[PDB]
């Protein structure tokens, strides 16, 4: 009998406790040892209907991964002073020498571990005086922590089983006659990014575009690639030399002093590489909308930076890379693209519940490598004279990251 389930999740991994990375310990300590040597039993003449858009597994995973943040904002990560008015100066100083209005070196009186002993020190704003806090500003990065998506395996509930559709082209919302029972999931990483899908799954056949209602322009357009595109993100400069904690509730997080070749950060990815994939996408789209309709892509028309540009986590530090150039083109039915990005630490997590703030990056520079495995777009629409259809970068609901994986998974109850 094929019922449910609905709902629960049981995470797991083979990562050892020797690693202290935040996502590793969320899978090593907050979850249980996994089971290597995966195995599937294909069902014989059985058709299972999936529903990714009302899938409780996605809801659970979305809640859980967000809830995992509670694990950090409790022990060591805090919401405390200081928010003393920081007074900002010009670019500092000798080695840079750069046209960057984003790195704001601002000074303030920092109270030490001593009751009433202040000290003039420097910090960094990004984007006068102030321009900080005024909200649930959750500070402190603590030692170790470190954020990077780690493969987490989810195994069937006690008494229940996980069904997995093996359909190379599955809308995630229909019947699948090709379905197998599997002990646990392949291992789903807590991908933290907007607009772009980093290190997700790939379609077996062609680029799979999915959306509850593709005609409904409030719905996000999930575009699962059949090929990876390597994004190599690198910090051109260096600074914030490690962390210097001051007192029980005091810390010199940020600045450093060593500075370097300060300049706008960015990621390297051959522009032709994902230009290929955009070719694939517009071919899929035009076949969905008119069978011969011109497909135009455009950048964000506004909104919070987090969803306006490509926000993603690299090593705990959040980068906001403007990828307008990756959209600004039209497809009618050695050079690489270089995207301008910005590092923050202030991030809006949950539903405006608070703003997590980490730092310092520690050490210097940084390198993160992740392969794009799909996009999230949103269609404009128009009248009968719309002709060419316009897609702009979407995002805003990280749950989509889980949808792109769980569309083929479904826990089931048997009698």
């Amino acid at each position, epitope marked *: 009998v094929w019922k449910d389930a609905e709902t629960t999740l049981f995470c797991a991994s083979d990562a050892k406790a020797y690693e202290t990375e935040k996502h590793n310990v969320w899978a090593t300590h907050a979850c249980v040892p996994t089971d290597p040597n995966p195995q599937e039993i294909h069902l014989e003449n059985v058709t299972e209907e999936f529903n990714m858009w009302k899938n409780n597994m996605v809801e659970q995973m979305h809640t859980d991964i967000i809830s995992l943040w509670d694990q950090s904002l409790k022990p060591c990560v805090k919401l405390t002073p200081l928010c003393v008015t920081l007074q900002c100066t010009n670019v500092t100083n000798n080695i840079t020498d750069d046209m960057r209005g984003e790195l704001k070196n601002c000074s303030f009186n920092m109270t030490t571990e001593l009751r009433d002993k202040k000290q003039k020190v420097y910090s960094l704003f990004y984007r006068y005086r102030l321009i900080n806090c005024n909200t649930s500003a959750i500070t402190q990065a603590c030692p170790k922590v470190s954020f990077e998506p780690i493969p987490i395996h989810y195994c069937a509930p006690a008494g229940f089983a996980i069904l997995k559709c093996k359909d190379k082209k599955f809308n995630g919302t229909g019947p699948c006659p090709s379905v197998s029972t599997v002990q646990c999931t392949h291992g789903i990483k807590p991908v933290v990014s907007t607009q772009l899908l980093l290190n997700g799954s790939l379609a077996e056949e062609e680029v799979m575009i999915r959306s509850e*209602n593709i*005609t409904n*322009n409030a719905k996000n357009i999930l575009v699962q690639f059949n090929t990876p595109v390597q994004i190599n993100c690198t910090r051109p400069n260096n600074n914030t030399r490690k962390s210097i904690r001051i007192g029980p509730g005091q810390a010199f997080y940020a600045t450093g002093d060593i500075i370097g070749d300060i300049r706008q950060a960015h990621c390297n990815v051959s522009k032709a590489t994902w230009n290929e994939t955009l070719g694939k996408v517009v071919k899929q789209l035009r076949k969905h909308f008119g069978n011969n309709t011109i497909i135009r892509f455009a950048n964000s028309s506004g909104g919070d930076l987090e969803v306006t540009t490509h926000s993603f986590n690299c090593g705990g530090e959040f980068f906001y890379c403007n990828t307008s150039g990756l959209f600004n083109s039209t497809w009618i039915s050695n050079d690489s693209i270089t995207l301008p990005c910005r590092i923050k630490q202030i991030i809006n997590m949950w539903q405006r519940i608070g703003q997590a703030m980490y730092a310092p990056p520690i050490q210097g520079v940084i390198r993160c490598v992740s392969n794009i495995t799909g996009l999230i777009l949103t269609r404009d629409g128009g009248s009968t004279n719309s002709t060419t259809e316009t897609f702009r970068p979407g995002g805003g609901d990280m749950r989509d990251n889980w949808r792109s994986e769980l569309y083929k998974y479904k826990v089931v109850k048997i009698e």
Partner: antibody, heavy 125, light 102 residues
Framework: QVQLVQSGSGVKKPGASVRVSCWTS?????????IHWVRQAPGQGLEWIGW?????????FGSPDFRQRVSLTRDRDLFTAHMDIRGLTQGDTATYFC????????????????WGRGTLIVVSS | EIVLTQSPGTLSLSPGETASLSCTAA????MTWYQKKPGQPPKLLIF???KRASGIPDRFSGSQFGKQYTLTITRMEPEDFARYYC?????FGQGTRLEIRR
């Protein structure tokens, strides 16, 4: 369906700009995902403008014309929505409403929980 | 095809009669339908095609035949006469004026 508290009716000139405000109680603001906007010409039907997300502030419109002409901003802390229109033209003379679309509308189409009071914007020198 | 063709543009029927409005969709999907009185904001009467909103009289029913969105208003009262509009996603219909037949 308690009306969403909009700004008073206003008169601007061609080439001018205006921020038409619309705000309501916390509950409704938290119930609604996007804030949409729609205008009607005098003696005409409904002409849909665009929407702005209450979670992210992301925007999208029925036309690039609205993308440039109309800037939709929002503030959760103030539970208020702003509509800024620049390069006001004669054809922008119309009555404007905001409308709230709750979460979990599924595939039921665009239905709205609350509607705005209504703001008449006139563009004339 | 134009997204919506709401008709007729004007419908005059006497009190106690049943109004039958047709909004022809260019596509498939669930429909919504609003009342709008003179000087008053639009007001959701029917959503999801055939699911009336809370606080809406049962005499307001809805359906669809293929793409022909159907709207039924039985036993119309004198206070049930106004402007009405269909909507499919971000698009509105042509608009209808419901009037009293004399």
């Amino acid at each position: 369906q308690v009306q969403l508290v909009q700004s008073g009716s206003g008169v601007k000139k061609p080439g001018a700009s205006v921020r038409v405000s619309c705000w309501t109680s916390e509950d409704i603001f938290e119930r609604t995902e996007l804030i949409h906007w729609v205008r009607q010409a005098p003696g005409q039907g409904l002409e849909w403008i665009g929407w702005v997300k209450t979670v992210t502030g992301a925007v999208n419109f029925g036309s690039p014309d609205f993308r440039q002409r109309v800037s939709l901003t929002r503030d959760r802390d103030l539970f208020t929505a702003h509509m800024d229109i620049r390069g006001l033209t004669q054809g922008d003379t119309a009555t404007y409403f905001c409308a709230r679309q709750k979460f979990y509308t599924g595939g039921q189409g665009w239905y709205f929980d609350l509607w705005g009071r209504g703001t008449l914007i006139v563009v004339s020198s | 095809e134009i997204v919506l063709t709401q008709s007729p543009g004007t419908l005059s029927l006497s009190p106690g009669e049943t109004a039958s409005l047709s909004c022809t969709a260019a596509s498939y999907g669930h429909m919504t339908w609003y009342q709008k009185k003179p000087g008053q904001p639009p007001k959701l009467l029917i959503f999801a095609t055939s699911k009336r909103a809370s606080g809406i009289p049962d005499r307001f029913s809805g359906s669809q035949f293929g793409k022909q969105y159907t709207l039924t208003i039985t036993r119309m009262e004198p206070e049930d006469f106004a402007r009405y509009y269909c909507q499919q996603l971000e698009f509105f219909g042509q608009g209808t004026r419901l009037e009293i037949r004399r």
